[model samples]
Target chain A: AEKPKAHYFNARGRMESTRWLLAAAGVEFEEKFIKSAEDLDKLRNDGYLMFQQVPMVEIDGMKLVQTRAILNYIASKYNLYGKDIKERALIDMYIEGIADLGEMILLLPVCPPEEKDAKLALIKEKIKNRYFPAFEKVLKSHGQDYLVGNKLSRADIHLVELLYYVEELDSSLISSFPLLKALKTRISNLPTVKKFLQPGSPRKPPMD
Target chain B: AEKPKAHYFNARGRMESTRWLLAAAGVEFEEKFIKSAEDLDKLRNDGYLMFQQVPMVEIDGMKLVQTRAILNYIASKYNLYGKDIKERALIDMYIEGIADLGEMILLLPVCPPEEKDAKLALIKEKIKNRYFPAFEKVLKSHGQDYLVGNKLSRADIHLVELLYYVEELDSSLISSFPLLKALKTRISNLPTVKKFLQPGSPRKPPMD
Candidate 1:
């Protein structure tokens, strides 16, 4: 199959979700890590100047921007596009909310340390008093498993991946939601996820 | 029908698009004017505390955050949930990209005048150099009328809505994308959309 040439930031929070989308689907492609200015400049000027963003997918050389677009493409391609119309809308809504929260979580590393305490406090308060309750209700309604349908979904995978994102940032972040904690713990035990997490497997926490 | 009370800060951008979704679908909802801290307090201490942001939605006495989620609920209830699975994914991708750009355009009112010039310059560069080409391809492939299918999906409405957003904020901001201009014009011609967009109606541009 003709797969796109994909480039993503080596950092976890930036585009690991896209990487996970492709990897979990077993899509074959060349993955390039563009770290330095010269590498970026060379690629940028060569018709890639517009997308100053990372985790770009080039299908037959046309770069696709925005993480959600890429994830939607991958989800559709891999038969994870939900069962019915309602299911599909629910899935999109779930991913949209997850992405919104993911943006907040992703901002912490770039923020100054002095502001970290305030930012993290806001995140904790919102997660506990706001997002957590919604998530808990959903889990309870769905029998403590998938957020939408009968099978494993991209949102389910996103749930697991975001857990690691929060875990790496601060392990205690997950302590507040026991269901979320158990979900992350169970997904981590899966054989493939375990293999992906083995020592030095490029799937470690977002930092260097 | 049980109509829920909806509080919005201003009828300008995404908030208005969301309101249109509800109105177009014939869902009964009350619009509350929130111009001061006092107005916010009415919704804040009540069920609205969980959203952590404005443009929230409450249905059947339950509040739901995230515009896409509320949009989905409205779409699902009204049979606007796209044609099929692939079409729905396409809607997701299209809406996701447009919403990301909507976030960028929201800076006009929020940013100071001195910095607005440089900020808009970069934003226009993004639309011209990146978004125009990509969306043009989608429009061209799907034919210039609708984005994916025959009827108006969330993607089409959101696109039309955001174009109105940019036009009101600064028409010059998106002068480069003629297709977008024409597309918005087409949506405005719909009787339903036309009635919802009458001058002086809360449905007009400048949503919060």
Candidate 2:
């Protein structure tokens, strides 16, 4: 089988979820880095990027862009979605909340120095007070190994990847939410994810 | 059948897309206005909001939160999503692009005056240069009336709604993109959408 190919920058950025997800699915893939603006322009000029955006994946004979869309396709294909439509719907809701939190973390590296302090403070506060508390509530409601279902799904993986991003900001971040803490541990300890976390694996280091 | 109850502000913020999707699906939903922060707090305290956000829909025995999740469920249950996973994936990608553009419009009413001109210019340029052109290319790809397959799905409705918001900014925004112009006409004239467009319909006046 032809391996799925990911087109992205060398940095983790948005593509990290794609890496985390494909890893959890036990799918080995290759990466084609856009090393310069010219490389990205050539991709757009060649019409590979549907929206002229990266984190685009070439999978199953289709070029998929849009992070959530790509994530959903992978989750559904790998049986990591859910048992049925209702569960999928619940999973989608949880993914969006995680995506929102992920967006805040993504901003940290790019935020203007003048604005970084306020942005950092907001992200820290929201993760502790608003976002993590919400996920903890979900875990408490079902007491499941995953967020929406008994099995691991996209939400669990996405949440774990995002938790790692914020933990780079503060390791003690998930300390208050024990359920979330357990979830991070459970997801990260998966054999494939453990491989990705090891040095020399393709996991891109956090941006300087 | 019980109408899907939407909890949002009196003005159309994020909830506008919910209204648009439900309207396009011919689903009549009731709205409970969160007229104040206290009202929203009660919902959060009572746990109606999973993420402490608005734009949640109480539908099908589920109080669904997150805009894309709510939109996806409405689209799927109404058969407005797509024929299968592949088609659904394509629709999702299109919806995200439109959501990004809709966000630009959403920022207009709230953007600081000092930043409005640059923001407006960027939105105008992106609508004409980047966004509409991309949709136009998709339409030209297969000569289909809709963005995805031959049917009217969430993508078409969302693009049309976002067009309306941008057209509110500049009447001639779509003049160069004939395909998008026709799409707006085709979607807006749908019986249900037409009803929503009529005066006295709950379709909101633009925020001042």
| Docking level for model 2 | medium
Angstrom error of the Cα, residue A107, model 2: value is 0.4
| C-alpha TM-scores of all predictions | 0.78, 0.97
Rate residue B96 of model 1 by lDDT. 67
Per-prediction DockQ comes to 0.37, 0.75
lDDT of 1 by residue, A76-189 (tens): 768776875456666765676677678888887787899888998888776667666666667777674667776767777777787777676667766767777777777667
Residue-level error in angstroms, candidate 2, position A184: 1.8
User: Scored by CA lDDT, what does every candidate get?
Assistant: 0.69, 0.87
Q: What is the DockQ of candidate 2?
A: 0.75
Worst 10 residues of 2 chain A by lDDT: A103-112
TM-score per model for chain B alone? 0.84, 0.95
Candidate 1 C-alpha lDDT tens digits along B46-155: 64744446776656555655676677767767766586655665676667678778889875668778988899888877777776666666776657587877777667
What candidate 2 keeps of the native contacts, as a fraction, is 0.67
